[PDB]
Point group: C3
Chain length 53, copies 3
């Protein structure tokens, strides 16, 4: 599974770690994160994220 | 996947569109929507919805 | 699927019933409950739960 980066602040979503404190369990692919989730550091929406190739 | 209608207000849940602003991604079957979700237009619970055959 | 117990208060999570009022549908294995969920009776985190063997 691929990492994704917040293109506003630089935060990296790592699927192995998830974002458990906001309800995103380890092993969740980015696409499957609920679409109302926001960057945990800066607060912007998922549409500001991009895949890290 | 089937559409579902709110039998109180008439809203249509379309699985191809989801309800992303409330965390329901495109491609989510109605049954798999978390059971605390409510109609985005009128606020009633899932138990007021019915399958559109 | 296994039941899990809150080791603080004694609540039992039964996967057949879920916890629908908090968005956990029937049939959800404990591991797949979002990791920000808390015991519905006492409020402690998932890390205070244990599998009932
Ligand atoms: Zn950010
Ligand atoms: Zn409605
Ligand atoms: Zn408890």
């Amino acid at each position: 599974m691929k990492k994704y980066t917040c293109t506003v602040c630089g935060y990296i979503y790592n699927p192995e770690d998830g974002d458990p404190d906001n309800g995103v369990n380890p092993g969740t692919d980015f696409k499957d994160i609920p679409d109302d989730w926001v960057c945990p550091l800066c607060g912007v929406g998922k549409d500001q994220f991009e895949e890290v190739e």
